[PDB]
Design a protein around this ligand. Structure first.
Ligand SMILES: CC(=O)N[C@@H]1[C@@H](O)[C@H](O[C@@H]2O[C@H](CO)[C@H](O)[C@H](O[C@]3(C(=O)O)C[C@H](O)[C@@H](NC(C)=O)[C@H]([C@H](O)[C@H](O)CO)O3)[C@H]2O)[C@@H](COS(=O)(=O)O)O[C@H]1O
Ligand SMILES: CC(=O)N[C@@H]1[C@@H](O)[C@H](O[C@@H]2O[C@H](CO)[C@H](O)[C@H](O[C@]3(C(=O)O)C[C@H](O)[C@@H](NC(C)=O)[C@H]([C@H](O)[C@H](O)CO)O3)[C@H]2O)[C@@H](COS(=O)(=O)O)O[C@H]1O
Ligand SMILES: CC(=O)N[C@@H]1[C@@H](O)[C@@H](F)[C@@](OP(=O)(O)OC[C@H]2O[C@@H](n3ccc(N)nc3=O)[C@H](O)[C@@H]2O)(C(=O)O)O[C@H]1[C@H](O)[C@H](O)CO
Ligand SMILES: CC(=O)N[C@@H]1[C@@H](O)[C@@H](F)[C@@](OP(=O)(O)OC[C@H]2O[C@@H](n3ccc(N)nc3=O)[C@H](O)[C@@H]2O)(C(=O)O)O[C@H]1[C@H](O)[C@H](O)CO
Ligand SMILES: *[C@@H]1O[C@H](CO[C@@H]2O[C@@H](C)[C@@H](O)[C@@H](O)[C@@H]2O)[C@@H](O[C@@H]2O[C@H](CO)[C@@H](O)[C@H](O)[C@H]2NC(C)=O)[C@H](O)[C@H]1NC(C)=O
Ligand SMILES: *[C@@H]1O[C@H](CO)[C@@H](O[C@@H]2O[C@H](CO)[C@@H](O)[C@H](O)[C@H]2NC(C)=O)[C@H](O)[C@H]1NC(C)=O
Ligand SMILES: *[C@@H]1O[C@H](CO)[C@@H](O[C@@H]2O[C@H](CO)[C@@H](O)[C@H](O)[C@H]2NC(C)=O)[C@H](O)[C@H]1NC(C)=O
Ligand SMILES: *[C@@H]1O[C@H](CO)[C@@H](O[C@@H]2O[C@H](CO)[C@@H](O)[C@H](O)[C@H]2NC(C)=O)[C@H](O)[C@H]1NC(C)=O
Ligand SMILES: *[C@@H]1O[C@H](CO)[C@@H](O[C@@H]2O[C@H](CO)[C@@H](O)[C@H](O)[C@H]2NC(C)=O)[C@H](O)[C@H]1NC(C)=O
Ligand SMILES: *[C@@H]1O[C@H](CO)[C@@H](O)[C@H](O)[C@H]1NC(C)=O
Ligand SMILES: *[C@@H]1O[C@H](CO)[C@@H](O)[C@H](O)[C@H]1NC(C)=O
Ligand SMILES: *[C@@H]1O[C@H](CO)[C@@H](O)[C@H](O)[C@H]1NC(C)=O
Lengths: 286, 277
């Protein structure tokens, strides 16, 4: 595979025509008022969420990616194809690693690496794995996971669907309560999907909802010189051996495989791979 | 029915030996610290709720019932027995009316009255009737209902069960957001049920959970000279007409009812089970 830098820089430019990526990356203190009602990207207009004093105080003063440049970025999706890949070392060699939905790395370092400079956080994660921080043990458990992220960016899309409302309140209270004890940089994108969709609509991709992976590719394009994709393979068989693969690399070996058209996303990324825009890894790195 | 004032004043003294009612009525700003962890009365100790700056700012500075003394109080429970009772007028004649769980009055004035000086708010009400304030319309509805409460007290027990955690955050944010626009006096009791249960334990009543009604009786005893009960009847037939009755008038309780009937018979309180007209 040979990187075609020119083609990729052309893609970046084309993305920037539809997406102000530096701005879209996160709301900032001065871009919202206290009390302001937010709507949700994928919900009916009637659904709203008021920004408290507290929520606003958690927003960054300036975009966390402003004047940032990384040469080689890894964007790591969560496919079961990473299991046994030994891509850890190659991923960690990147200048910047994006991960998705707070995926675990410690237990899987050999395959997925231990370097994390950004991880996303679908709010459902707090309900699904941290019980909405209802108990002392869940609170401790979340706190430790966050501490292990050190100074990475935690990218929390709270305004895409209205079911995030309650978790957002819980998160805001937890982060205010623990202000000063964590180095994680919070980032909170607003209603950005009408802009992100515009780019991918021209490539003949428009599902109900773009996936987190492709949303990370989109932002990486603004600040990375060369993007290398890992963990993008939304199928239930290994492309080589054909053995059952779980949907996620941290599902129990065994596990059997709505709004996404992940296959169409994949075919489009494979296409880009072939044009030299980006490197999609589908095999063992070692 | 003839009030036995002496028996009632003895009951009040006995309640006050176990329950500092005026204090237990509500947490106040200075009785919690920011970042303090609250436990829940009926939940395992592991469940906690961290006091936010915002939650604290919604607490009253002093108990809203301190030095309030009313003569006749109505405590209105939510039984379907009120339907067609025409007790509205007799309820509204009271000096002070307690209602339960934000029950509706407008559509039912003739039967339940329109006077409200306190209403309780099980946090589940927000989920059940206001959709967690997720929409503009639910927010508008809740706002108007609250505005109609004028300067009444809204008594919100948020620390009895851990399922109230999330809705507490929703409520806090809504009240902070509308700070200045509502005259309602918020009240937020803490962990009071070990004290309240002590009084009722001696009367041979101890279920998993005392009902809101009997909790309102307990508090009314401290600030009312005479309590009159309406909407207390947890059974599915009407004692007079014998027709099926809904549980609520806008659709162990038996031990509680038998105990209140007992108190009625002793002249402590007046339990109305019939049409007022
Ligand atoms: C009761 C029932 O089955 N109803 C379902 C809806 O719950 C369901 O919506 C999704 O529900 C989950 C909770 O289990 C989440 O609330 C989800 O919201 C997120 C999420 O937190 O996971 C919101 C994030 O902002 C999204 N992240 C993005 C867009 O990058 C994220 C993401 O789109 C999904 O995780 C999909 O991978 O969703 C609710 O969307 C709904 C099914 O729709 S969807 O497949 O989730 O699009 O269907 C109702 O009937
Ligand atoms: C999964 C399942 O079915 N488990 C049930 C629980 O549903 C049940 O929990 C009660 O859950 C309801 C859900 O609507 C409420 O969250 C309730 O909490 C309140 C309430 O908000 O209504 C908490 C209030 O502070 C209580 N007010 C008081 C004590 O004055 C109030 C009160 O006890 C009412 O009778 C119930 O509304 O409850 C949760 O307690 C759980 C316990 O059942 S029960 O409500 O005692 O009947 O039982 C599980 O089986
Ligand atoms: C249970 C459930 O519904 N799983 C969804 C899943 O449909 C997926 F859509 C997505 O992301 P998630 O699986 O974490 O995976 C991160 C990204 O990796 C790529 N990928 C993933 C698996 C795979 N086999 N081939 C791939 O290509 C996709 O671009 C995906 O967006 C999402 O928001 O897009 O979110 C999760 C969960 O909400 C999340 O993991 C909570 O812990
Ligand atoms: C399903 C559910 O969650 N229902 C509960 C219910 O188990 C009951 F426990 C109680 O109160 P709720 O029914 O509104 O009624 C107020 C009081 O009226 C008396 N009563 C009621 C019905 C009846 N036929 N005869 C009576 O004697 C009881 O003293 C009760 O305390 C509570 O905490 O006591 O709270 C409600 C809900 O939280 C509320 O209605 C949501 O809007
Ligand atoms: C930015 O990275 C490019 C590309 O680096 C190469 O490919 C990466 C994925 C990784 O494998 C690197 O180790 C590879 O070197 C660098 O461009 C290369 O630079 C080296 C150093 O002089 C040179 O030997 C190669 O010929 C160049 N290769 C290509 C394809 O252009 C570049 O040096 C990096 N720049 C900075 C400032 O980090
Ligand atoms: C890099 O990719 C681009 C994107 O398609 C290629 O650029 C165009 O290629 C076609 C080939 O006929 C021409 O129509 C254009 O004139 C090319 N653009 C430019 C700016 O020259 C390019 O061929 C690719 N480079 C490599 C090494 O494959
Ligand atoms: C990307 O994130 C990693 C952490 O995963 C950062 O690398 C660490 O930096 C600290 C401080 O220098 C070192 O002590 C660690 O040894 C590094 N850890 C790993 C796993 O490599 C890295 O510097 C971040 N890169 C950025 C922000 O460009
Ligand atoms: C509810 O009221 C009871 C009093 O009836 C309070 O309990 C007393 O608290 C003081 C000071 O903390 C103790 O020294 C007493 O011994 C307690 N009395 C009993 C009988 O235990 C209680 O603090 C009040 N609680 C709230 C939240 O208001
Ligand atoms: C109890 O609450 C009621 C409201 O439900 C109060 O009565 C209202 O008071 C205003 C101001 O004095 C009057 O203009 C209204 O006509 C009254 N409304 C009703 C329905 O009677 C009443 O004052 C409150 N009582 C106490 C003791 O606080
Ligand atoms: C996203 O970018 C567009 C320009 O692409 C802009 O007009 C809009 O405000 C942005 N939205 C954000 C940062 O939420
Ligand atoms: C009223 O109640 C008290 C307490 O039991 C009792 O001693 C008194 O005799 C009663 N008086 C009546 C029924 O007139
Ligand atoms: C209490 O109400 C009754 C009934 O009208 C009345 O007769 C009695 O004197 C009232 N007032 C006081 C201060 O007790």
């Amino acid at each position: 595979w040979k990187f075609n830098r020119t083609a990729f820089l052309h893609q970046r430019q084309e993305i920037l025509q539809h997406v102000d990526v530096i701005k879209n990356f996160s709301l900032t203190k001065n871009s919202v008022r206290i009390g302001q009602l937010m709507h949700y990207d994928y919900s009916s207009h009637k659904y709203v969420f008021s920004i408290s004093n507290n929520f606003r105080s958690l927003l960054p003063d300036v975009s966390p990616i402003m004047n940032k440049h990384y040469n080689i970025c890894a964007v790591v999706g969560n496919s079961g194809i990473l299991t046994g890949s030994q891509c850890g070392q190659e991923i960690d060699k990147s200048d910047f690693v994006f991960r998705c939905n707070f995926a675990p790395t410690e237990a899987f370092q050999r395959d997925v690496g231990r370097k994390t400079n950004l991880t996303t956080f679908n709010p459902s994660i707090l309900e699904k794995y941290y019980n909405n921080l209802l108990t002392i043990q869940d609170r401790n458990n979340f706190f430790l996971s966050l501490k292990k992220l050190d100074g990475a960016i935690l990218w929390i899309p709270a305004f895409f669907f209205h079911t995030s409302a309650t978790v957002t309140r819980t998160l805001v209270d937890f982060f205010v309560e623990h202000r000063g004890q964590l180095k994680v940089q919070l980032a909170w994108p607003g209603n950005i999907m009408q802009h992100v969709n515009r780019y991918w609509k021209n490539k003949h991709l428009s599902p109900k909802r773009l996936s987190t992976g492709i949303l990370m590719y989109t932002l990486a394009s603004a600040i990375c010189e060369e993007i290398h994709l890992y963990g993008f393979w939304p199928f239930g068989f290994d492309p080589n051996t054909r053995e059952d693969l779980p949907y996620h690399y941290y599902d129990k070996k065994g596990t059997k495989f709505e709004s996404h058209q992940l296959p169409a996303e994949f075919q489009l990324l494979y296409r880009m791979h072939g044009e030299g825009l980006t490197k999609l890894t589908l095999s063992h790195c070692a």
